[PDB]
Amino acid sequence: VLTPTEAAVLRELRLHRPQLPLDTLLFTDPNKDPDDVVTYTIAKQLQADGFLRLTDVVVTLGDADMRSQRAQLAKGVFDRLALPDVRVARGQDYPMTSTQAREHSKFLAEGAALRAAPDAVHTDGVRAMCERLATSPHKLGMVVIAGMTDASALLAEAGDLVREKVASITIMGGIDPARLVQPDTRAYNNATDIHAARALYRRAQQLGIPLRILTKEAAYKAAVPPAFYEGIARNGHPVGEYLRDVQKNALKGLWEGIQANLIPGLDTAWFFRTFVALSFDAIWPQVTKLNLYDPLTLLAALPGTARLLFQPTPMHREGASPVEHVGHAEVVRPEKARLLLSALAKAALV
Ligand SMILES: [Ca+2]
Secondary structure: OOOHHHHHHHHHHHOOOOOOOEEEEEEEOOOOOOHHHHHHHHHHHHHHOOOEEEEEEEEOOOOHHHHHHHHHHHHHHHHHOOOOOOEEEEOOOOOOOHHHHHHHOOOOHHHHHHOOOHHHOEOOOOHHHHHHHHHOOOOEEEEEEOOOHHHHHHHHHOHHHHHHHEEEEEEEOOEOOOOOOOEOOOOHHHHHOHHHHHHHHHHHHHOOOOEEEEOHHHHHHOOEOHHHHHHHHOOOOHHHHHHHHHHHHHHHHHHHHHHOOOOOOOOHHHHHHHHOOOOHHHHHHHOOOEOOHHHHHHHHHOHHHHHHHEOOEEOOOOOOOOEEEEOOOOEOOHHHHHHHHHHHHHHHOO
């Protein structure tokens, strides 16, 4: 069940269903934060409503065994969302410094019990995506909400196909100051594998495939409150309880760390200014602002939802391969984006 205003926004989106669902290839790094799994959850409702069909997911971030743990978790979540036919595969190796090893090996305890068995996920990265680009009668969309090792691998291995079978590439990323458009080395997903990010941004443009880049500023504007997570956990859906528990515990850990001055450069003032001697139970209720970067990227990737919420700004040189930017100014309906994200996640968890 939805609230009156949630039910209305979902009715409104439903007027804009496409004739055919858009087949979708997703590149993702779940269980180091809530974002990717919120995206899988809203994708379930978008699939149920005929906007997309999530055919293949390739998982990155970490060494080979870590990528398999993430892929097992993704497949576990798709199973619990009754998306039984999503094909999940581990992505390929990529270069990691010692500093990256620590961050890229983050795997939140709440996801451990959600993992499908190891043999439920595939080890051959983008092979199935290649075969599917070959045999699709209609163009597919590519959505990147993680590092780009595999997305770039796909454009490289199937460069012949992608030119005629991929409609757009939408990325949670960032555009470097200097230009062809190239990736910002500071943006998290680009920094996961910066050479692959450069190869992808560059090759998409050489191949004439439209790029749409959603940046962290777009999410700030449409940040959701804790009620978003409490709403989806309310009825005991395991994916809803996972999301609320991961967000609440991540935030608890950040609060406690700052309280003890253990996170250099951050302080109580930064925490109140970002999210708003206390225990975390007295802070959780004051929080009002939680970012959903990856779900917004997915909303930006589908024309039906994009036209509802966004007015992307073109960044390419007049006449060149299109590159659009979605930042704070381009999120034109943020309260509607908030309400639509809540509507989709609650409907998905029925
Ligand atoms: Ca992500």
